[PDB]
Design a protein around this ligand. Sequence first.
Ligand SMILES: Nc1nc2c(ncn2[C@@H]2O[C@H](COP(=O)(O)OP(=O)(O)OP(=O)(O)O)[C@@H](O)[C@H]2O)c(=O)[nH]1
Ligand SMILES: [Mg+2]
Ligand SMILES: [Mg+2]
Ligand SMILES: [Mg+2]
Ligand SMILES: [Mg+2]
Ligand SMILES: [Mg+2]
Ligand SMILES: [Mg+2]
Ligand SMILES: [Mg+2]
Ligand SMILES: [Mg+2]
Ligand SMILES: [Mg+2]
Ligand SMILES: [Mg+2]
Ligand SMILES: [Mg+2]
Ligand SMILES: [Mg+2]
Ligand SMILES: [Mg+2]
Ligand SMILES: [Mg+2]
Ligand SMILES: [Mg+2]
Ligand SMILES: [Mg+2]
Ligand SMILES: [Mg+2]
Ligand SMILES: [Mg+2]
Ligand SMILES: [Mg+2]
Ligand SMILES: [Mg+2]
Ligand SMILES: [Mg+2]
Lengths: 50, 111, 55, 403, 53, 119, 51, 49
Amino acid sequence: ALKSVPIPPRKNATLDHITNMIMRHGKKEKAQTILSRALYLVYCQTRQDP
Amino acid sequence: FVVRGTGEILVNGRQLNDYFLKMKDRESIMYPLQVIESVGKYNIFATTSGGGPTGQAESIMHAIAKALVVFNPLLKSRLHKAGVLTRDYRHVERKKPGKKKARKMPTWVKR
Amino acid sequence: MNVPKARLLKVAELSAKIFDQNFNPSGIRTGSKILNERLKGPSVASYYGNPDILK
Amino acid sequence: AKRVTPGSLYKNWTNTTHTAQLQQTAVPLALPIFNFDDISKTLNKVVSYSNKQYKSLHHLGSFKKSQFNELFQKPVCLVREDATNSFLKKLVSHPVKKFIITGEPGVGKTVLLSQAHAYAVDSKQIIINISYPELFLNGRNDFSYDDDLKLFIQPMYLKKLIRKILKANDPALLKSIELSKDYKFSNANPKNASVKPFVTLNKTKNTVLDLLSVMTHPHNRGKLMKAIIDELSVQSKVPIMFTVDNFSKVLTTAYSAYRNTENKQIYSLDLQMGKLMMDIISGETKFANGESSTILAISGVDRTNKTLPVALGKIPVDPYVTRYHYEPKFVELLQKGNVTEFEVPKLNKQEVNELIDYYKQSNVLLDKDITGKKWENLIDEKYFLSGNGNPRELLKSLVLSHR
Amino acid sequence: KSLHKFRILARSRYDHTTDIFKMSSDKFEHASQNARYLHDILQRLLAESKDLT
Amino acid sequence: VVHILGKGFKGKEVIKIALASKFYGIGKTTAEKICSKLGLYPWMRMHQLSEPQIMSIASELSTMTIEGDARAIVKDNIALKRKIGSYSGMRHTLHLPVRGQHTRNNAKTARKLNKIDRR
Amino acid sequence: NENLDFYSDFILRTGYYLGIPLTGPKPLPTRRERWTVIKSPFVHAKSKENF
Amino acid sequence: SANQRVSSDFAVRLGEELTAIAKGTSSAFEKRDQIHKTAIAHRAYIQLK
RNA sequence: AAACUCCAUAUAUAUAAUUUUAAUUAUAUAUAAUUUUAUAUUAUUUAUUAAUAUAAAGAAAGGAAUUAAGACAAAUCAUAAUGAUCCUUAUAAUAUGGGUAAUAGACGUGCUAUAAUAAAAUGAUAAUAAAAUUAUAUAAAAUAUAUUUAAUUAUAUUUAAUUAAUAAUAUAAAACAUUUUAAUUUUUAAUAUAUUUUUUUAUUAUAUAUUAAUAUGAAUUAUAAUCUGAAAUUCGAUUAUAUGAAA
Ligand SMILES: Nc1nc2c(ncn2[C@@H]2O[C@H](COP(=O)(O)OP(=O)(O)OP(=O)(O)O)[C@@H](O)[C@H]2O)c(=O)[nH]1
Ligand SMILES: [Mg+2]
Ligand SMILES: [Mg+2]
Ligand SMILES: [Mg+2]
Ligand SMILES: [Mg+2]
Ligand SMILES: [Mg+2]
Ligand SMILES: [Mg+2]
Ligand SMILES: [Mg+2]
Ligand SMILES: [Mg+2]
Ligand SMILES: [Mg+2]
Ligand SMILES: [Mg+2]
Ligand SMILES: [Mg+2]
Ligand SMILES: [Mg+2]
Ligand SMILES: [Mg+2]
Ligand SMILES: [Mg+2]
Ligand SMILES: [Mg+2]
Ligand SMILES: [Mg+2]
Ligand SMILES: [Mg+2]
Ligand SMILES: [Mg+2]
Ligand SMILES: [Mg+2]
Ligand SMILES: [Mg+2]
Ligand SMILES: [Mg+2]
């Protein structure tokens, strides 16, 4: 059963890159929160997947 | 300690959410149980010690991958290709004697 | 800290007498640390070795 | 310059989401209406509050920020047998009716309080709710000393509280309660007060509605609050449900941020608000109605000490603990009131399933979870990622975990 | 009662977790003197603890 | 705008912080004591003062060392040092550091601020 | 470590023949002291050596 | 572009810009067109190399 | 040169009565990789082969030391030692004070800031480390003090245990949650308003200025105490009440 299923992705690539661009001084949770907060906003205003 | 059951986890006797605030640490811990689609079939009892949260979480994930092999030995490759069965040798490198924090040097003046 | 201070200090000086220990309830400067400090003279004096080494 | 146009978001994230009307774009999903008398049909199933319940709860402050409500057109709840049904059965059957809601941060203590409020509204009850006790402990409201009451009075906080009590409870019950004794308050009406210096209320002719609707001067607002509590305590017609959320804040800061004329902190029990709260908890007020209850809830945002666990009998009494971490007076005041503990349990697998399902129906999930992931795997993984059933963490993983 | 008095007079020298009394001495310049000093202090504490008058 | 002893205050700033800032001689603690003595809640603003309250603040704040009095005390202390003939007085006269700092480098702010008529 | 281990082994043998139960050499953690010093005699502080 | 907004939290301002872009309303597109027009203005110098 | 070497890594054996506990460890010996195998797409001296990718077998990926011959008459006679030359009542030896800390200018290194992808408070079943130190000692807990109930911070009172896988230095801090934060009228409060209640809406007040130093920033200085020392003026370190430059 596990053959046909691909390996689940390591981690999203574009989101990792964007976080790393925001991230600075080694503070990644702050960057992820900022990005996740913004994406939560854009969904609430557009009701489309961010 | 991995024993079959439902998706229950405990770190040092505490809940996963209490111990690991970051959701990425929980995701890393759960990845082995996700490479193989058996997230809701095993009970984890993690007893990490040493280092900071990410080192603990990633050591838990590595230990889980090692423990899952005993349950189905012909699932080793899937985990190996997933990279969870390799030990991350990366670690802090010693502060070099004549310079600042290792691999950094004080400002060099031409004249 | 419900227990009255009188009881606590009664235990304090009783133990002090039992264990041969100073009791200074008021906190005045008794200068005890001056006397109790160890003498380091023997060690400092032999910094340069035995002067009676054969020549 | 103007800078901020009339339509624009300028506050931080939490206040922006809390107050921006982001629920306007939410799809109007149809759900069964909350009703304890029909618990058999709404059990283990998401529900929406009744319109009158929504009005009363909004006026009581049962819905707070950081609850993700803005995701949906209106706040919704899940009827959890272990948390909602069990608690309400205990509340109805137990004779003392004095509880404190406890649980891990984010488990849903507030929600359970709001469900209790919904029960009270639909059971023809009067609700007095202290949503954020910090407002009368943080030193951002006026205060004065009333020698007649021997307590410090906070007129702004009172005015808001009576306003909330008036606008939350149905006028029918407040009218149905007649005053047991006369009152004579100063008059502060913008126009009438020029002619009439004082306002009088008489027995069996005016109700508590008129008492709530009167307007006096700040130094007498404490008299009005004491009268209101006494009137509702003596009357034995309607039950009174006194609720306080974030009670751990009260239990931890025994001393407020107010300083008297000698630059000394004003003990909490020297305030009127703290005193009446503790009198109700300890049973000194002694409401006459049998069904009158007192439900308290703690919040994780507030520090923790040895006060509450000792009060709840969870740990013994160590008398050498500093007052900053153990307040014996509050412990004996809580124990004297026979306040019992209710622990909100974490979600199980099936509860998570229902919640996530409803989230799917509301179009609040990512396509990675929906478009591609198996439902079973999704539920299990989220159950794992949410610390085995923490509702806040579950919501965070679904809509606030873009990674 | 004597045990409670003994425990509260030992102060930091007694740990309730394991119930072990603990005491060391090196003021005197020989082991024999320190052992006698410790024994005498233990006798003194026991005598006072048993005196509940 | 609230005027206390000739000091201009905006209507938005807290009493304790504003008092501690504008007046020479009263700091955070003194302002807190002043506000507490007159029964103004900790985070009260300058808008909400009434005329009696402003008068009380001005009256009670005028029974302690005023800006001018405190400046006089400082200047008198410097003058004492200089008239005695002490080393410190000499540094004050020459616009040089007085607390044993190095002059080979820096010592700019001392030259700019140290003097016999220090504010 | 070589002399330590050899002597330990000897201690165990002597104890056994003397009737003394002995558990055996337990490896307590080693202690690493560290000093640093400039290699040059006069002035090359950039060059340092660890002992 | 998101740093030209009045809020004090960049999560809010990032969200506002992203929402605006999602509806095709922002000045960043002009920069993209300018770069492409410049690339066209430099058609013939590309070489296989 | 590379390799042997050391730190680190994976595994095996041994030791430890799992109260020196942690066995998730410590340290002795050994094995392991300067990875192997297969396939294909390449250019080629034609697989009697290289790089490109794939596959599968693996835990397997780093750092440190070692910097040759000669050249720079590079540095060192102030680590120490010797040759030559020079002083020998002085260029040798001791003590009390001062200087090495002076300040026009200039200069190389750094520390701290100039605010909202950032500063401050709080967080007691005390979130989570590693490596080092304690017979010329480390110094807990409790106390009085400033200081209010307490906590935090700094002294004083007294030395608990430990000369160490045992006790102390020592509850790591960022992280994360809550509250606050001037410029900012984007704020407060006075009334009403209400299905945004820790909150929205309407009216009035929230003035006087503009490229600006704030509730940024802590330089300079006044005073009172404290620590070490026999001694704190030239010339030491902390705390408190004021000061609050430049940026
Ligand atoms: N639908 C639904 N959401 C719930 C329920 N219980 C909790 N939640 C959600 O879980 C989160 C936390 O709920 P709260 O009631 O604030 O939890 P709490 O434990 O009282 O929170 P703290 O006081 O901060 O510890 C919010 O997102 C709630 O909406 C429930 O029964 N139904
Ligand atoms: Mg580092
Ligand atoms: Mg809550
Ligand atoms: Mg001032
Ligand atoms: Mg063990
Ligand atoms: Mg080599
Ligand atoms: Mg060479
Ligand atoms: Mg050459
Ligand atoms: Mg030369
Ligand atoms: Mg020379
Ligand atoms: Mg020489
Ligand atoms: Mg001489
Ligand atoms: Mg020098
Ligand atoms: Mg240098
Ligand atoms: Mg800042
Ligand atoms: Mg260690
Ligand atoms: Mg070690
Ligand atoms: Mg201490
Ligand atoms: Mg901590
Ligand atoms: Mg300027
Ligand atoms: Mg400041
Ligand atoms: Mg200061």
